[PDB]
Enzyme design. Structure first.
Site, mmCIF file in Angstrom:
data_model
loop_
_atom_site.group_PDB
_atom_site.id
_atom_site.type_symbol
_atom_site.label_atom_id
_atom_site.label_comp_id
_atom_site.label_asym_id
_atom_site.label_seq_id
_atom_site.Cartn_x
_atom_site.Cartn_y
_atom_site.Cartn_z
ATOM 1 C CE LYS A 52 68.927 41.404 -62.505
ATOM 2 N NZ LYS A 52 68.939 41.623 -61.012
ATOM 3 C CE1 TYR B 87 63.432 38.061 -61.690
ATOM 4 C CE2 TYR B 87 64.714 36.748 -60.171
ATOM 5 C CZ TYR B 87 64.633 37.725 -61.154
ATOM 6 O OH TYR B 87 65.780 38.367 -61.597
ATOM 7 C CG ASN C 72 72.042 43.042 -58.927
ATOM 8 O OD1 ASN C 72 71.717 42.416 -57.921
ATOM 9 N ND2 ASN C 72 71.466 42.850 -60.101
ATOM 10 C CG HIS D 113 68.932 36.063 -62.671
ATOM 11 N ND1 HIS D 113 68.476 35.747 -61.412
ATOM 12 C CD2 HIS D 113 68.837 34.921 -63.402
ATOM 13 C CE1 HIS D 113 68.114 34.477 -61.377
ATOM 14 N NE2 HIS D 113 68.319 33.952 -62.570
ATOM 15 C CD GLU E 55 67.180 31.070 -62.980
ATOM 16 O OE1 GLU E 55 66.775 31.586 -61.882
ATOM 17 O OE2 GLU E 55 68.339 31.251 -63.459
#
Lengths: 182, 182
Positions: free
Chosen positions: B10, B50, B156, B159, B170
């Site tokens: 990310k 998502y 965080n 993913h 994905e």
């Protein structure tokens, strides 16, 4: 308008897990990766990537003719010609097999004097004579005589743009304007 | 036919120079990278990557609501609603803003039980309680209270596909057949 250079991790390099070890060296130096991708190139792509000028074919040709003398290899017996441009076309063809034999990873590095800094970090064309500290010296032991005997190019891990001009061309080749993100 | 999973570094993690460190943990475990690219994603792309299932929105929403409760934040004063699904839609918008805020790096990792392996290596959702050794415990000190106080999602780092089913989806989403190389 900060300078950029293109770098490719060739198939031995990727297959041996060197992507992260090589990325770590550019990062630590202060270069940003501004484009990155793993690709299978077709022979066609590799053919147009490398130059086709007579000057380039010719100058790659002599390097190998010079080599063949020192090992006492008759180039006519080895590859069927002693002509510098024709020998260049044979090297380019060898280059094409090797860069075509597995996935590559292509990246654009951006930073003050990127092009020269990357050449310096990467080190000279033969790993066996590349000084320790250089990517080629720390991660390979291949040599131009071994390559000449096995009928291949040197497995020297990477290609780095050899100039600002060549960098703008090789960058545009691999990346559309909006894949290079600064 | 061996299992694959999708991992995204990310924007925070790309900016901090963690691409190589993270790639190193996977290489060391025996996972192969079979797809890799740096991308600037658009809002719509992240919107479609998502899920938009009520089920997913609902559960994303309860976790934030539980978080608010232990903190004694009133979700109605904070974000205007306490409806789980409406809260999931707010989180999704925050997810979009963060994943859209700079370059990501997307990779596909192949190996025995890749999805769990990668989930194991990455660690739980909050870096602050992620154990040492995991990616989130070693590289981040973020926590859900701070993220809530600050009207954003947890930073965080990554993913990871949370199931093979979700991984085949994905994976297709980000890569044409030709880019996921066998």
């Amino acid at each position: 308008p900060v300078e950029k250079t293109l770098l490719i991790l060739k198939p031995d390099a990727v297959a041996r897990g060197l992507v992260d070890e090589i990325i770590s060296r550019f990062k630590k130096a202060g270069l940003k990766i501004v484009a990155l991708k793993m690709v299978k190139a077709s022979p066609e792509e590799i053919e147009r990537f490398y130059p086709s000028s007579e000057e380039w074919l010719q100058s790659a040709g002599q390097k190998l003719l010079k080599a063949y003398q020192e090992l006492g290899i008759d180039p006519r017996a080895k590859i069927g010609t002693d002509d510098p441009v024709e020998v260049g076309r044979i090297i380019k063809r060898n280059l094409v097999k090797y860069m075509t034999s597995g996935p590559n990873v292509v990246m654009v590095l951006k930073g003050n004097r990127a092009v020269e800094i990357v050449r310096k970090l990467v080190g000279p064309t033969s790993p066996h004579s590349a000084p320790p500290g250089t990517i080629r010296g720390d991660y390979s032991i291949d040599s131009p005589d071994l390559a000449a005997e096995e009928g291949r190019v040197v497995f020297n891990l990477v290609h780095a743009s050899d100039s600002p001009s060549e960098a703008e061309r090789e960058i545009r080749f691999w990346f559309r304007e909006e894949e290079v993100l600064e």
